[PDB]
Amino acid sequence: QTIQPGTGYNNGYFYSYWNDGHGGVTYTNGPGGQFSVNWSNSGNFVGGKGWQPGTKNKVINFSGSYNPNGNSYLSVYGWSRNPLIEYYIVENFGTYNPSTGATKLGEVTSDGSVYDIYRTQRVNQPSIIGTATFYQYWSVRRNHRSSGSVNTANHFNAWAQQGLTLGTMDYQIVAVEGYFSSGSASITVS
């Protein structure tokens, strides 16, 4: 049901909901792996369901509707530790392609589309272990969609081939992220 930021377990799925406090966001956990997000002139937020910990060969399925009006992403999102890495496999996005100005590190074909791979660096930013400097790895789908299946191993193996290694897996979720925008989404994970 409607909850305030936090992390926990719901119907067998790990969930994480965070927001910068600006307001304008409603996150609701549904049955099974379902979750809904409704936002209007929000601030920055991230919300989704998945696993804690994730794995490097997980096949993630998602089904739903995603209607952003502004800056937002729909992705398989997570972290690794040692090395500390924040990663995204972007399936759809709004007005801003998150790879803008990022360094392209290759291409990978998976689950019906070509994905462009990028690497970016975050300096002194919040992370799962505190403020730190770390890399972000991205796989951005060329053919946008709101349902599908993601074979994570295809992305992690392609990243490894390019020198983008991952450490020990931390949480792994299908999440909706927004940055001062409006929208609605209803996703079921499995």
Domains of the chain as residue ranges with CATH:
2-190 (2.60.120.180)
Asked if 150 and 60 touch (Cβ cutoff 8 Å), the reply is yes
Distance CA(34)–CA(63), nearest Å, equals: 9
Q: Is 13 annotated as a binding residue?
A: no
In angstroms, what is the resolution?
1.6
Percentages (nearest 5) of helix, strand, coil residues in the chain? 5, 65, 30
Q: Which of 91, 111, 116, 177 is catalytic?
A: 177
Distance CA(117)–CA(3), nearest Å, equals: 34
Q: Is 142 annotated as a binding residue?
A: no
Cα-Cα-Cα-Cα torsion 91, 92, 98, 101, nearest 10 degrees, comes to 90
Q: Which of 86, 91, 111, 116 is catalytic?
A: 86
Helix (H, G, I), strand (E, B) or coil at 157: helix
Whether 177 sits among the annotated catalytic residues: the reply is yes
Q: Is 141 annotated as a binding residue?
A: no
Whether 91 sits among the annotated catalytic residues: the reply is no
